[PDB]
DNA sequence: CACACATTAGCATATGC
DNA sequence: GCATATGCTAATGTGTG
């Protein structure tokens, strides 16, 4: 309910703290990880200051830049101290649409690629191939 | 675990200060 | 040139057999 705004509210004072202490965001998410662990790309700092990310993701990074927010104001110097692919894979699909783990492994040395990259990769197509 | 489908979060490049 | 906004899709995660 009345989290959205609450949210909104504390998204606000993040980019008046975050512009004041000249923190970019890619800044803001090494400083993350330094400080976690789980170090955030910067899209994901933007999509939040803009407010682009889900309710779920929202209130899952409220807590890491409270933290944040409020520990690193005591000091900060020890702080900071391919297409053809795609057209080949394409390719290998319009004949076999589900193929087994032993071809898996034949296409993924063909390519170059991670077997698990290549099966991740062949799941989200089966995935946006099921969307229509 | 793993995978059926839903969420999530980082990449390449598009804009902008 | 660096730093933000987008489109887009690897990757995980919920849930499960």
């Not at 391919?82 to 004949?95: A, D, K, P, S, T």
Request: aromatic share 8%; with cysteine.
């Amino acid at each position: 309910k009345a989290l959205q705004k609450e949210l909104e509210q504390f998204a606000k004072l993040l980019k008046q703290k975050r512009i004041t202490l000249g923190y970019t965001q890619a800044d803001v998410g090494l400083t993350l990880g330094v400080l976690f662990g789980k170090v955030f790309s910067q899209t994901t700092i933007c999509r939040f200051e803009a407010l682009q990310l889900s309710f779920k993701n929202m209130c899952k990074l409220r807590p890491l830049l409270q933290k944040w927010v409020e520990e690193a104001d005591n000091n900060e110097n020890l702080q900071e101290i391919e297409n053809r692919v795609r057209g080949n894979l394409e390719n290998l699909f319009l004949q076999c649409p589900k193929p087994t783990l032993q071809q898996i492994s034949h296409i993924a040395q063909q390519l170059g690629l991670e077997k698990d990259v290549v099966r991740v990769w062949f799941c989200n197509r089966r995935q946006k191939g099921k969307r229509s």
